[PDB]
Amino acid sequence: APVRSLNCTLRDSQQKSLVMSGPYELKALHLQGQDMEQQVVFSMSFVQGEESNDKIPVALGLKEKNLYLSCVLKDDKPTLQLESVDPKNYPKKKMEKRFVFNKIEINNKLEFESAQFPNWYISTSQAENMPVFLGGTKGGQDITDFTMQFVS
Amino acid sequence: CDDWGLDTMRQIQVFEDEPARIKCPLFEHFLKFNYSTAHSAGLTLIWYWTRQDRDLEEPINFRLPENRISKEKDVLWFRPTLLNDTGNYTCMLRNTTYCSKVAFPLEVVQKDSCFNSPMKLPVHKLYIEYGIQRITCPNVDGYFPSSVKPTITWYMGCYKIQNFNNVIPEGMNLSFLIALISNNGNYTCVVTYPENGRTFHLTRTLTVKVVGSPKNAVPPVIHSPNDHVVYEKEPGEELLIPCTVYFSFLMDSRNEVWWTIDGKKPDDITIDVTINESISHSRTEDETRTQILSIKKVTSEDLKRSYVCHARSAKGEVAKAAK
Amino acid sequence: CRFRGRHYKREFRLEGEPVALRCPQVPYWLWASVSPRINLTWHKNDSARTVPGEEETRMWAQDGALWLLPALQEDSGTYVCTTRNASYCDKMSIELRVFENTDAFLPFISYPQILTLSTSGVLVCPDLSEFTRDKTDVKIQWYKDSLLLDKDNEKFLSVRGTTHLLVHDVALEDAGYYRCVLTFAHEGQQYNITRSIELRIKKKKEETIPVIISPLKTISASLGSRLTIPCKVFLGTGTPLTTMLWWTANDTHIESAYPGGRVTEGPRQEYSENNENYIEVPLIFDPVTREDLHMDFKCVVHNTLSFQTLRTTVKE
Ligand SMILES: *[C@@H]1O[C@H](CO)[C@@H](O[C@@H]2O[C@H](CO)[C@@H](O)[C@H](O)[C@H]2NC(C)=O)[C@H](O)[C@H]1NC(C)=O
Ligand SMILES: *[C@@H]1O[C@H](CO)[C@@H](O[C@@H]2O[C@H](CO)[C@@H](O)[C@H](O)[C@H]2NC(C)=O)[C@H](O)[C@H]1NC(C)=O
Ligand SMILES: *[C@@H]1O[C@H](CO)[C@@H](O)[C@H](O)[C@H]1NC(C)=O
Ligand SMILES: *[C@@H]1O[C@H](CO)[C@@H](O)[C@H](O)[C@H]1NC(C)=O
Ligand SMILES: *[C@@H]1O[C@H](CO)[C@@H](O)[C@H](O)[C@H]1NC(C)=O
Numbered sequence: 079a080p081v082r083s084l085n086c087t088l089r090d091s092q093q094k095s096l097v098m099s100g101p102y103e104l105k106a107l108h109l110q111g112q113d114m115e116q117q118v119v120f121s122m123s124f125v126q127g128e129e130s131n132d133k134i135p136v137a138l139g140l141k142e143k144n145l146y147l148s149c150v151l152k153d154d155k156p157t158l159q160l161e162s163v164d165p166k167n168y169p170k171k172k173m174e175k176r177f178v179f180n181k182i183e184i185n186n187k188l189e190f191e192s193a194q195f196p197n198w199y200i201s202t203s204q205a206e207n208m209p210v211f212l213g214g215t216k217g218g219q220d221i222t223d224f225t226m227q228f229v230s
Numbered sequence: 231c232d233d234w235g236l237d238t239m240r241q242i243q244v245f246e247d248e249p250a251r252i253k254c255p256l257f258e259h260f261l262k263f264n265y266s267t268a269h270s271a272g273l274t275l276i277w278y279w280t281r282q283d284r285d286l287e288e289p290i291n292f293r294l295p296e297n298r299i300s301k302e303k304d305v306l307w308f309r310p311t312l313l314n315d316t317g318n319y320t321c322m323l324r325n326t327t328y329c330s331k332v333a334f335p336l337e338v339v340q341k342d343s344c345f346n347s348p349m350k351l352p353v354h355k356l357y358i359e360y361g362i363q364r365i366t367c368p369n370v371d372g373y374f375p376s377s378v379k380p381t382i383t384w385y386m387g388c389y390k391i392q393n394f395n396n397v398i399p400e401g402m403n404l405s406f407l408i409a410l411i412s413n414n415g416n417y418t419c420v421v422t423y424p425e426n427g428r429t430f431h432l433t434r435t436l437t438v439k440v441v442g443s444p445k446n447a448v449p450p451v452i453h454s455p456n457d458h459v460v461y462e463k464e465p466g467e468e469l470l471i472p473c474t475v476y477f478s479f480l481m482d483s484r485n486e487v488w489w490t491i492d493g494k495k496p497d498d499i500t501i502d503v504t505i506n507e508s509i510s511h512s513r514t515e516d517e518t519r520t521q522i523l524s525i526k527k528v529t530s531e532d533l534k535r536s537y538v539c540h541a542r543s544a545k546g547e548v549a550k551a552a553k
Numbered sequence: 554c555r556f557r558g559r560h561y562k563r564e565f566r567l568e569g570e571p572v573a574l575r576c577p578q579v580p581y582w583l584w585a586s587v588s589p590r591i592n593l594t595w596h597k598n599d600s601a602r603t604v605p606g607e608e609e610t611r612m613w614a615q616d617g618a619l620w621l622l623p624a625l626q627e628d629s630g631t632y633v634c635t636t637r638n639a640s641y642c643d644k645m646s647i648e649l650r651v652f653e654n655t656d657a658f659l660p661f662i663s664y665p666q667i668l669t670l671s672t673s674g675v676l677v678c679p680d681l682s683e684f685t686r687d688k689t690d691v692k693i694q695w696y697k698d699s700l701l702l703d704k705d706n707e708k709f710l711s712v713r714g715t716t717h718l719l720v721h722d723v724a725l726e727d728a729g730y731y732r733c734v735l736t737f738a739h740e741g742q743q744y745n746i747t748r749s750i751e752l753r754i755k756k757k758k759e760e761t762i763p764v765i766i767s768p769l770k771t772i773s774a775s776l777g778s779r780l781t782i783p784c785k786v787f788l789g790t791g792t793p794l795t796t797m798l799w800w801t802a803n804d805t806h807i808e809s810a811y812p813g814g815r816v817t818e819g820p821r822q823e824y825s826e827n828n829e830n831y832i833e834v835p836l837i838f839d840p841v842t843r844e845d846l847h848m849d850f851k852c853v854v855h856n857t858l859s860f861q862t863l864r865t866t867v868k869e
């Protein structure tokens with residue numbers, strides 16, 4: 079075995095789902111009953127970039143697909159982007175730290191700090207269609223922590 | 231005169247360019263019961279200060295000019311205070327018989343517009359994921375009449391609070407809808423109000439800290455004496471014995487862990503032994519204490535003799551070791 | 554011009570209330586590039602001639618979206634936006650279905666909102682953005698099965714001027730259908746805008762602190778070059794979830810440092826074994842040799858509730 083990954087679906091604090099629309103972007107909006115399985119499903123896998131009881135390093139990318147999200151500086155400011163990958167190599171441990179996150183999970187609610195940029199988190203606006211993005215502000219106007227449901 | 235040294239370590243700190251309201255210490259010479267302070271005996275309350283200097287001075291207050299230091303009722307009143315006010319202060323009581331003076335260093339603190347300051351901030355525990363909690367602007371009391379309606383805004387960092395995802399300003403109170411770890415940080419309310427044709431500021435800041443719910447306050451859980459890991463040691467193996475214990479969070483919680491040779495703080499007969507004591511805290515402030523035992527050669531009696539790890543915190547717990 | 558694609562969120566609204574189809578993924582109200590605006594018009598799949606204009610006086614086009622107040626049953630259909638930069642052009646469709654305002658049709662309009670039980674949680678009224686561009690902060694009224702929730706109610710708190718309904722401490726009986734109801738105010742017309750929320754409860758997940766069970770200093774050895782190894786962890790109850798059995802000498806990492814291929818650890822074993830219990834096991838194997846003849850080795854088990862470790866003695 080390479081890396082024990084797992085499929086799941088995240089959904090944020092205000093109940094918004096997580097559907098793709100790019101693949102140059104992701105969005106977080108309310109899915110009607112009859113549209114629920116539009117929401118992307120994630121392949122989360124443990125990379126083990128740095129040990130800590132608090133942080134569990136995890137790289138996650140979209141399953142049945144080749145995308146994996148990673149942080150990069152679009153003009154010296156952290157930006158969330160979807161980089162494609164060789165389906166041959168991945169999933170893999172010790173993954174490039176652009177692709178690495180460390181989930182801070184507490185009582186079933188979990189945040190995702192960036193390894194590349196500490197104190198920068200996967201976030202979402204409270205508006206509806208606005209995209210998922212890397213965020214520098216925690217506990218502000220943008221939603222940082224989500225809740226995941228495992229899937230099959 | 232009955233005289234108490236200044237409250238050196240019980241110090242006061244005040245923001246510049248905005249009203250203070252200092253009280254004279256009556257926790258010494260207690261004197262407050264069944265209708266507060268007694269001026270009836272005719273014990274005049276005298277004020278006077280000295281500044282960072284070498285001399286005492288009568289306190290000018292009437293032509294300040296704006297009664298800027300007028301004491302309205304058995305207590306001092308700066309509207310507004312000024313950096314030059316820093317220094318030690320004194321109040322005393324006079325009866326033809328009675329005298330009593332005491333001092334307290336008043337350090338005036340400059341303020342950044344981002345609320346940066348040397349001022350000590352009060353930590354304010356807040357239970358995690360509770361339904362809804364809130365915080366009131368700390369020390370607004372008595373600064374202004376019920377008649378006037380104040381404007382009052384809040385700020386996390388220099389970040390003003392508006393459209394926050396789970397925090398909401400509600401007049402004097404700040405409400406946290408589902409207190410998450412994301413909510414840690416220094417907060418600061420800033421209340422404005424008009425008085426005699428002027429706007430005074432009151433900025434005060436406290437740091438919110440999210441902690442474990444009482445919803446999950448539970449007796450300590452013993453981990454190490456699990457028995458699935460069996461501690462057997464043939465004669466003279468320098469055996470070690472760790473006792474890791476998880477504590478749920480409570481405020482008046484005195485977490486205690488101790489080994490029990492059989493009920494008397496070890497070291498019976500020779501029995502040379504010593505404890506190593508580690509500790510860890512969750513982000514939530516959930517302690518997890520640990521203890522261990524360095525050991526010499528194992529005397530024949532040790533194995534068949536039982537000893538046990540212990541812990542208690544508003545609840546009590548116990549676990550049996552194995553050899 | 555190109556057809557870019559179908560808009561993911563179809564919209565099953567109710568009859569007799571407003572609707573707003575914003576051109577899919579074309580605008581986001583990000584109207585920075587809007588000076589001399591781009592040509593824009595909608596049209597039905599079957600009905601093309603529309604401006605889209607208006608059947609009666611119902612339909613029109615606000616900033617980037619056409620409305621249907623009231624939206625009528627039969628208005629159901631598919632629509633396509635249009636965009637024109639002489640340098641470009643494309644289109645996208647929003648599906649739409651209007652139902653009758655019968656209680657019977659509710660389960661089809663429902664938004665699934667989830668909350669784990671024995672905790673506080675929040676229900677947000679969905680799809681209200683286009684109409685919430687006013688400062689009378691959201692005058693919504695939450696009903697539960699035709700039961701209006703007043704501040705007198707202790708179980709549910711309606712957040713003042715917001716879309717959130719605070720469930721203070723959710724219980725099994727709290728599952729079911731709810732209703733957002735935004736009273737609108739356009740041109741002086743006051744209209745209801747309903748939203749069916751359906752709450753699903755979930756049980757908080759098991760997560761136990763495991764113990765390790767292979768602490769013995771390698772009792773055996775001889776240089777047979779075959780190295781057997783198990784790190785047995787005890788899960789009180791089956792919860793191989795975030796649980797992770799990472800093997801590292803201590804510093805080495807057992808991978809991309811200690812091996813050029815020399816040493817690695819293959820598959821894993823979630824035994825289950827004894828009925829009630831559940832257990833997991835790794836296997837670091839020096840497939841053909843163990844030569845250096847010295848190493849600190851450490852079994853790392855790690856999940857959200859504990860970072861644990863283990864080391865062992867010299868061997869034979
Ligand atoms: C208020 O009183 C305190 C204590 O009397 C003063 O601090 C003293 O200052 C001298 C000269 O710098 C130091 O050598 C002493 O050690 C201090 N006393 C003590 C007990 O530490 C201080 O000057 C006064 N505060 C102000 C603002 O003047
Ligand atoms: C919230 O306030 C606390 C206390 O004022 C800040 O913690 C201080 O941070 C500095 C580092 O910049 C430490 O050297 C000090 O020891 C801390 N003060 C004390 C006494 O705890 C903290 O920086 C503030 N939080 C944030 C995120 O800005
Ligand atoms: C405050 O202190 C300065 C510096 O000694 C002094 O010059 C000034 O007179 C003081 N301010 C007032 C209002 O007297
Ligand atoms: C002055 O004050 C003291 C303190 O209570 C009191 O004992 C004494 O009687 C007073 N002298 C009078 C009566 O003026
Ligand atoms: C459309 O045309 C304008 C004007 O030439 C140009 O600035 C713009 O980049 C074009 N649109 C896009 C997205 O390229």
Ligand SMILES: *[C@@H]1O[C@H](CO)[C@@H](O)[C@H](O)[C@H]1NC(C)=O
Binds near residue numbers: 734743744745
């Ligand atoms: C809005 O909803 C309420 C409650 O169901 C109802 O009484 C009222 O008739 C509705 N308003 C309009 C404009 O029909």
